[PDB]
Structure formats: C-alpha cells, structure tokens
Design a binder for this molecule. Structure first.
Ligand SMILES: [Mg+2]
Ligand SMILES: [Mg+2]
Ligand SMILES: [Mg+2]
Ligand SMILES: [Mg+2]
Ligand SMILES: [Mg+2]
Length: 155
RNA sequence: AAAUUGAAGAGUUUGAUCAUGGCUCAGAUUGAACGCUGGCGGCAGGCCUAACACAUGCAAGUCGAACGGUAACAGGAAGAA
C-alpha cells in the first residue's frame, strides 16, 4: 500500500589512474498516500543497485505532514540550496498541477489538490528536499490553537 | 443558481558536482508569406509595403404641390384629314 516513485537517475563519474569510473545515482520517494513521505538517495555501480538502495533509505527517514482532506492547510514556501519552492491548497477537482519532482512527492504524500511551482534551480535532489521540508513545517489548525492556547472557532 | 473558484518544466559549461548565468525547446496567438498537397460547406478576414501615381465607369441628388415654362414623348382638341 506504500506508494514509491522513481524521480531521477543520473550518471556521475570518479577519476583514477586507469581512467574514469562510472557509477549511478537514484532519487526516490515513498509515501503512504495519507500524510507520510520519505525521500531516499542511493549510489551504486549499476542502476538497479542504486534504485534499490534509495527505496531502502526512503522507507525510513520518513516524516509526517498535517494534511487537510487531501489538500494543504495554507500556502507554504520551501527552500534548500538552489531551490525555492512554493505550494498552494487548491479547491477540489484540480488535482496536482506541478513539476515532475514535486508531483511525485505530493502524489505519494496524499496531497490530492495543489498548485505548485519551483523557482531557481530545478535540481531534483534539492527540489524534493525543499518540498518535504515545506510540508513538514506546515502547521495545522489544531497546533496553532494549541500554541496560542485557545480552542476558538479557529478550532 | 452561476458569472478571474488559478500557477508544471526540459536540453546545453564539468571527468563528475553544486551554484551562478545566458542560449535553446514544449504552449497559446497571427490581417501572414513560401514549399508540398488540396473535396464540399457555414461564418469571418483580405495592400501590414509607396499619405506612390492613377486610364475608364460608377460613388449626390431630388421637388412641376415655389417659378416663368416647353424640347423631348404621351395623349387629348376647334380644325387640318
Ligand atoms: Mg537558475
Ligand atoms: Mg563533457
Ligand atoms: Mg499549387
Ligand atoms: Mg465572405
Ligand atoms: Mg483598396
């Protein structure tokens, strides 16, 4: 039932006496379709070993986001290295309109209706990093009520 | 009752990387042209250039119920046949 998505595969290279050593990298996300998302990143000489190492990482290192009927609480900004990220809770019917890197994160997360956009570097590893943290710092109508010490209508 | 209730990214500097930064692509749009091709219809559009120059026709007339009027054609008439 966990949902897992392959976001990007890439070839890097290391240089030695004999020449270049080629390897691969894999960036993935797993999610429970109901408010939990992890991302993983693995390296290996062959692609399958890399796509597999990443899922393994993605399964742990997983976090919770305070969803709201399949959509977000409030607009949110996320940032990590080059990537400035922005997300909005859209009305019902829209679905996920977003770049590939973000769509995969939001899909597996369970965010059903959102407007998203990535600014600056669309480098996938940092875009997803920035989205996860955005969702993670995203606070909930109940916690702000708890924080402020009042269960007014706003609860 | 309804009536802006909406927003995607990709390639390319490096051995590889992240950042910076330009170039390039996917989209809509057009009073278009050219190349290949071309059956019918409805609705629209059609000198963007030389406010360059223009043969010919046509594009501003109408009223005899303002007026003297008859030259055309149309009848009518004492009177010519
Ligand atoms: Mg940039
Ligand atoms: Mg090279
Ligand atoms: Mg022809
Ligand atoms: Mg016509
Ligand atoms: Mg003309």
């Amino acid at each position: 039932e966990l949902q897992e998505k392959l976001i990007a595969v890439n070839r890097v290279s290391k240089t030695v006496k004999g020449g270049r050593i080629f390897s691969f990298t894999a960036l993935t996300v797993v999610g429970d379709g109901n408010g939990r998302v992890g991302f993983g990143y693995g390296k290996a000489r062959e692609v399958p070993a890399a796509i597999q190492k990443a899922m393994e990482k993605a399964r742990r290192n997983m976090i919770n986001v305070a969803l709201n009927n399949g959509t977000l609480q409030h607009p949110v900004k996320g940032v990590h290295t080059g990537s400035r990220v922005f997300m909005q809770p859209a009305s019902e019917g829209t679905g996920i309109i977003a770049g590939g890197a973000m769509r995969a994160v939001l899909e597996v997360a369970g965010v059903h209706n959102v407007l998203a956009k990535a600014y600056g570097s669309t480098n996938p590893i940092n875009v997803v990093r920035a989205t996860i943290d955005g969702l993670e710092n995203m606070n909930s109508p109940e916690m702000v009520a708890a924080k402020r010490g009042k269960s007014v209508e706003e609860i």
